[PDB]
Write a protein that binds this ligand. Structure first.
Ligand SMILES: CCc1nc2ccc(OC)cc2nc1O[C@@H]1C[C@@H](C(=O)N[C@]2(C(=O)NS(=O)(=O)C3CC3)C[C@H]2CC)N(C(=O)[C@@H](NC(=O)OC(C)(C)C)C(C)(C)C)C1
Ligand SMILES: [Zn+2]
Length: 187
């Protein structure tokens, strides 16, 4: 079926636009004539819910979430533009009404992760695709936030939340797809 937009996060505050009946319906129809807004979208399949983030006019998220699914749009289902499984990466054309995040070039190592509750979580950049959490978190607290953005102090995109780095059920750090690798994927 289709990936369906069921909410959005404005930059922070989250909003929901669609429920289980609507989501079950639109996952199946692929037709979503709903207004789109925001930089991060809350997105659902029939089984999973996570985040997706618009960068370079492309809406990016994780493959472990999206698979090869099409996305629901006002004119019908839209196929993926990018599918790079070894990056756990998929991308569709950013739907009308989304605004893309601007890539970070300030080189800051003080990052801020946005969760599906529109909570903003401090990260210390530890390297290209790695960030350590200042306060470690339970895995289930961060479940549903993959595909969501890591920002710099200025509000620029540093990457897309992919995997959590866990010891004994506690996330001590985050793995993210950097904005440069999206560039690489696009070319
Ligand atoms: C290798 C990644 C992967 N690839 C897949 C490819 C195909 C596939 O087929 C189905 C499944 C895959 N699963 C995958 O991983 C799965 C999915 C993914 C996941 O849950 N991602 C997030 C998250 O919030 N995810 S999410 O809940 O939003 C999900 C709905 C999208 C961001 C996490 C929130 C806590 N996973 C990890 O993050 C694991 N961490 C981890 O693997 O770290 C390593 C890479 C350093 C070892 C956990 C569970 C320990 C936290 C395991
Ligand atoms: Zn920046």
């Amino acid at each position: 079926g289709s990936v369906v937009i069921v909410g959005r996060i404005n930059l922070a505050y989250a909003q929901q636009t669609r429920g289980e009946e609507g989501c079950q319906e639109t996952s199946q129809t692929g037709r979503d004539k709903n207004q789109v807004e925001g930089e991060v979208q809350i997105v659902s399949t029939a089984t999973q819910t996570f985040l997706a983030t618009s960068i370079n006019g492309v809406l990016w998220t994780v493959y472990h979430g999206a698979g090869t699914r099409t996305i629901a749009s006002p004119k019908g289902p839209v196929t993926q533009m990018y599918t790079n499984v070894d990056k756990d990466l998929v991308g569709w054309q950013a739907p009308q009404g989304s605004r893309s995040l601007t890539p970070c070039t300030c080189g800051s190592s003080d990052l801020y992760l946005v969760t599906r509750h529109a909570d903003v979580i401090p990260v210390r950049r530890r390297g290209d695709s790695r960030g350590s959490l200042l306060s470690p978190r339970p895995i289930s607290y961060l479940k549903g936030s993959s595909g969501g953005p890591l920002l710099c102090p200025a509000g620029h995109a540093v990457g897309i939340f992919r995997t959590a780095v866990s010891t004994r059920g506690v996330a001590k750090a985050v793995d993210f797809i950097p904005v440069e690798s999206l560039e690489t994927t696009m070319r």
